[PDB]
Amino acid sequence: MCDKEFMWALKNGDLDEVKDYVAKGEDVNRTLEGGRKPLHYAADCGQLEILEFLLLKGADINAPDKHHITPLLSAVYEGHVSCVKLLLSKGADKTVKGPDGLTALEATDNQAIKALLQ
């Protein structure tokens, strides 16, 4: 239950709501919906302040295995790129689970995401 109130947080940026769950005991790696992580919604639309959160705790910055893709790229096709920046700052390398040169290459064409490659 409350599944919505939980995920609905990483959406509206209710960093105050998600902060309650994690406040328990480092719990950022569960299957949000049924096959996704609580970092996709935050990155795609986490005011850029939710990702850095549930991120500094665990490290789902790569935990993704069945998703055959990391959250870093999630922001790519989002236009935010505001997170990807302060993201790599923690490592998130640049291509740990990326199809290959896609990352920013086969991603888009804007200089924002390109901020990596040429």
Binding site: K4, K11, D44, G79, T108, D109
Partner: protein, 270 residues
Amino acid sequence: SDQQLDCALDLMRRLPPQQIEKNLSDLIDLVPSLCEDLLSSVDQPLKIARDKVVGKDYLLCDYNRDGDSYRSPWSNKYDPPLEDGAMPSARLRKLEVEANNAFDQYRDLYFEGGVSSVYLWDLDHGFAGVILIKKAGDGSKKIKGCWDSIHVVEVQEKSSGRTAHYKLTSTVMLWLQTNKTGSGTMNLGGSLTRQMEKDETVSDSSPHIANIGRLVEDMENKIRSTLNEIYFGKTKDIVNGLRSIDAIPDNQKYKQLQRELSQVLTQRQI
């Protein structure tokens, strides 16, 4: 005229579903004798309404529309200050309220939001109803999406046995649009329809709503897979068939093989 109605339905299935409203309107102008029949046989984008009194939104439909006004499932009153609008029997209205509440939870359990509306109307030896469901995706994302649910079941209560015959006929309407430079303007809408009939047992633990719910759930679940297959499946495949980014290894065989088979009919036949 019967044939006309059939042709009208076939036309709406051919013309772009993105202009169903405009087309539908024009279709009526061409045949004002099929307005009602078309206003109940042609599915169009579910419109959203507000219930000041209740302050809640309710979808519109030809099943809950009387003349030029619509009947709200919450307050049970048409938006437009009507006088003697068609209303369901006091006993029926009660069942309608429970259906709206029951489906209300089924909408937040599958859609986790959006709007839903249910309208019922007694019949000759039973009663029918329509379950509407509208869910819009994030309005802040580059790509937009809209899910319209239109279910029309027909219960056939039985004299004895309490067993009634159900005849559902949902019709999901998936809409997808995106205004990106790389894709300028891309619209991928439509809608699939599927009928379903089966006899179920009516009891205290399994009432009408319960039965109707099971059907709708199973119907939507089945349509949810077909939509993903056709939409992000067939269509896509067809698109890749039109052109290809990678140079297609020209083939002389096919062409050379066609020349033979051809000259066969041009120089023979039979």
